[PDB]
Write a protein that binds this ligand. Structure first.
Ligand SMILES: *[C@@H]1O[C@H](CO)[C@@H](O)[C@H](O)[C@H]1NC(C)=O
Ligand SMILES: *[C@@H]1O[C@H](CO)[C@@H](O)[C@H](O)[C@H]1NC(C)=O
Ligand SMILES: *[C@@H]1O[C@H](CO)[C@@H](O)[C@H](O)[C@H]1NC(C)=O
Ligand SMILES: *[C@@H]1O[C@H](CO)[C@@H](O)[C@H](O)[C@H]1NC(C)=O
Ligand SMILES: *[C@@H]1O[C@H](CO)[C@@H](O)[C@H](O)[C@H]1NC(C)=O
Ligand SMILES: *[C@@H]1O[C@H](CO)[C@@H](O)[C@H](O)[C@H]1NC(C)=O
Ligand SMILES: *[C@@H]1O[C@H](CO)[C@@H](O)[C@H](O)[C@H]1NC(C)=O
Ligand SMILES: *[C@@H]1O[C@H](CO)[C@@H](O)[C@H](O)[C@H]1NC(C)=O
Lengths: 250, 50, 299, 50, 50
């Protein structure tokens, strides 16, 4: 179905420290109170368009969502970025992958069915080892993990934030800014993407939003953390706030 | 103030659309900058007099 | 008789502070400029250069390059400047097309196989390869794309081999009218003309600071002195001021702080990850209080 | 009294020089004129700059 | 007035030291002139309003 995006999709536009200042920046952000599509993985992983950047978020309890596929035709005819989280090592590859009829990371794990061929590859990266959830579990979710994926002039920029939550039905109300983590120079024309769910079915949910060029007024507190924000095109009051560069209007 | 829109200020043409429709970006940005400087100066003069 | 404001007292620095990451490695430029085989321009290679000490004076002063053109930066400053990453876009082009590898330029190559950003910062390096890549009976290993549906955005690598439909007729791999292949090649021969000889071109894309730097020029660091007016250089960003201790909790990804005027407020030292506030050294107007010179010259 | 196409002349890899004033070579497909005159003559190579 | 120090005025960067530390003299003097013109205009506007 769909839900109302409640104060989400804001990331640090750059890596410069500021504090006790409201700084105005124009970049690709998720508009406030926009509609975001609600997907279920009980009793799916369809392909969505990739366009102007994508906001992705998920709530987890058993690490069902483990990866992403990005590209144009996704059929070994063009280059396609592949990100896989296999509970130990994060694997990033940029190959002309031949994908399976139903890509998934099924369960412990003994199936790796997301692709079948990898030829004419131009990039590979692997992070450090670790351990992750691999058992099918139930209950209220504990960690909401928000991501931003955008491609500007060949650089695929990934931002993310992990936070504890205690809420299953919808997005928690509150405010949280997304820090940058990864910047991959790939140069691939990406028009569609798909997520990867771990199937035993699952019981988790994820959210897909889309970014638009909007101007935001970001409030940095004394600790240099963004604590509030104004979506300058949300409504006339936000426009007024942008004009006066203040959150209080006389 | 309105009459000032007719001035070239060193540009090939006073009409902004006529610059944009015939030259590509690199040099056109220079020709546009010439008009922006002149027209911005015209507004500042108007506001000061007001 | 009166008080006049005549000048400005400004404390001058006493010593310089030069700070760079403590890396003891040289950048592998020899394995890229002196390579056994270059990639084709339709499938140009992009090698990442990082975590090393570079020296751009050797490449610039060497009398072997056919062209050495830099945007955003100047060739003699590269020894001081340092970067988060450097990318080397390596491919072979035809000589008369060297002029097309540039921001703001258009043509069949600039638009179909290698497009630069119009705000590109970096250097276009080229030299002829008539005695290495060209062969007798011609070199047919260099392919470029002649036909594309759209024009390339900057730094897209269109490796596709899909057959071009020059009309409404579907081709599905046929080579006839209204059905041509996008891939074409050059026959480079030692007897061909200057403009038709192969050239090896490497474009060096430089990312100014926004993150911890890993590729810095050949400059030794010095010790850091606090609470004194100094002329500092932190990863190539220079200025004058007093460096003091701070309580600003930078996030692991933040390297520099800024004021309302965009001047540097604080820096994180690249060798020891601590935050130093930069307060410009004390200054102020100087006024002279004097009786008129018809009475006394005391002030 | 005709329809011109300046992309063929510009993209063709046969001309020694192609230098335009007032207009940009990629905009000529959009622009139109009351008349065009072609001044045709042979010069010596080093004099092309003149 | 202080906010105006953040403007480029057509220059590659609003930070004067960042221009001087990367480009040599000849073109850098041009980039500096762009900032001088913009910042001098900003001061004149401030003084007139005062
Ligand atoms: C989102 O879309 C659904 C159906 O398209 C609609 O029922 C819902 O009210 C929308 N929400 C918002 C906030 O527009
Ligand atoms: C997951 O796949 C990656 C892909 O190379 C592999 O390196 C890793 O060992 C796999 N993890 C397993 C099987 O637990
Ligand atoms: C990859 O490169 C080889 C180079 O010989 C080429 O033959 C092949 O068609 C390309 N594409 C794929 C999918 O292998
Ligand atoms: C800033 O950080 C300090 C760290 O001790 C904390 O005590 C303070 O509360 C933080 N600021 C705010 C507004 O919470
Ligand atoms: C890092 O910098 C410090 C500065 O004194 C130096 O002692 C240390 O050896 C450097 N690290 C390496 C690996 O050289
Ligand atoms: C390439 O090789 C030549 C001679 O073999 C050498 O003089 C030159 O310095 C080399 N280039 C680099 C970048 O090492
Ligand atoms: C990217 O691929 C899409 C096909 O989905 C195509 O329409 C678009 O033009 C491509 N981009 C470029 C720059 O060619
Ligand atoms: C200032 O100088 C003039 C000329 O020397 C002299 O006549 C006048 O008295 C002086 N003023 C005072 C206050 O002494």
């Amino acid at each position: 179905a769909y839900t109302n995006s409640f104060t989400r999709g804001v990331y640090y536009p750059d890596k410069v420290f500021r504090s006790s200042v409201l700084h105005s920046t124009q970049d690709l952000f998720l508009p406030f109170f926009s509609n975001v599509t609600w997907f279920h993985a009980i009793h799916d992983n369809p392909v969505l368009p990739f366009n102007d950047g994508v906001y992705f978020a998920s709530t987890e309890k058993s690490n069902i969502i483990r990866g992403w596929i990005f590209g144009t035709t996704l059929d070994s005819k063009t280059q396609s970025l592949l990100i896989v989280n296999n509970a130990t090592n994060v694997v990033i590859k940029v190959c002309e992958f031949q994908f399976c009829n139903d890509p998934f990371l099924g369960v412990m794990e003994s199936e790796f069915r997301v692709y079948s061929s990898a030829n004419n590859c131009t990039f590979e990266y692997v992070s450090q080892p670790f351990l992750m959830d691999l058992e099918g579990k139930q209950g209220n979710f504990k960690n909401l993990r928000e991501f931003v994926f955008k491609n500007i002039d060949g650089y695929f920029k990934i931002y993310s934030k992990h936070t504890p939550i205690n809420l299953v039905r919808d997005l928690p109300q509150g405010f949280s800014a997304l820090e940058p983590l990864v910047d991959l120079p790939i140069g691939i024309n990406i028009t569609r993407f798909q997520t990867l769910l771990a199937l035993h079915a699952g019981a988790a949910a994820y959210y897909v939003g889309y970014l638009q060029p909007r101007t935001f007024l970001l409030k940095y507190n004394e600790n240099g953390t963004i604590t509030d924000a104004v979506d300058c095109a949300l409504d006339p009051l936000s426009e007024t706030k942008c004009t006066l560069k203040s959150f209080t209007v006389e | 103030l309105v009459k000032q829109l007719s001035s070239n200020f060193g540009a090939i043409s006073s009409v902004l659309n006529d610059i944009l429709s015939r030259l590509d970006k690199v040099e056109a940005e220079v020709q546009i900058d010439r008009l922006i400087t002149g027209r911005l100066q015209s507004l500042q003069t108007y506001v000061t007099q007001q | 008789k009166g008080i006049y404001q005549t000048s400005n007292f400004r404390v001058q620095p006493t010593e310089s502070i030069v700070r760079f990451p403590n890396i003891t490695n040289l950048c592998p430029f020899g394995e890229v400029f002196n390579a056994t085989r270059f990639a084709s321009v339709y499938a140009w290679n992009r090698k990442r250069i990082s975590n090393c000490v570079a020296d751009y004076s050797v490449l610039y002063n060497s009398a072997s390059f056919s062209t050495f053109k830099c945007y955003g930066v100047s060739p003699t400053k590269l020894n001081d400047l340092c970067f988060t990453n450097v990318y080397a876009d390596s491919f072979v082009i035809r000589g008369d097309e060297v002029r097309q590898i540039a921001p703001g330029q258009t043509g069949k190559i600039a638009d179909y196989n290698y497009k630069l950003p119009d705000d590109f910062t970096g250097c276009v390096i080229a030299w002829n390869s008539n005695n290495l890549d060209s062969k007798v009976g011609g070199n047919y290993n260099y392919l470029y794309r002649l036909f594309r549906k759209s024009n390339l955005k900057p730094f897209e690598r269109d490796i596709s081999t899909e057959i071009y439909q020059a009309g409404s007729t579907p081709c599905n791999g046929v080579e006839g009218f209204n059905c041509y292949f996008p891939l074409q090649s050059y026959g480079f021969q030692p007897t061909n003309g200057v403009g038709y000889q192969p050239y090896r071109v490497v474009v060096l894309s430089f990312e100014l600071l926004h993150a911890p730097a890993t590729v810095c020029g050949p400059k030794k660091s010095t010790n850091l002195v606090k609470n004194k007016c100094v002329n500092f250089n932190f990863n190539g960003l220079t200025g004058t001021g007093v460096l003091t201790e701070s309580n600003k909790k930078f996030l692991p990804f933040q390297q520099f702080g800024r004021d309302i005027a965009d001047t540097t407020d604080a820096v994180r030292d690249p060798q020891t990850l601590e935050i130093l506030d930069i307060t410009p050294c004390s200054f102020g107007g100087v006024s002279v209080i004097t009786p008129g010179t018809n009475t006394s010259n005391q002030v």
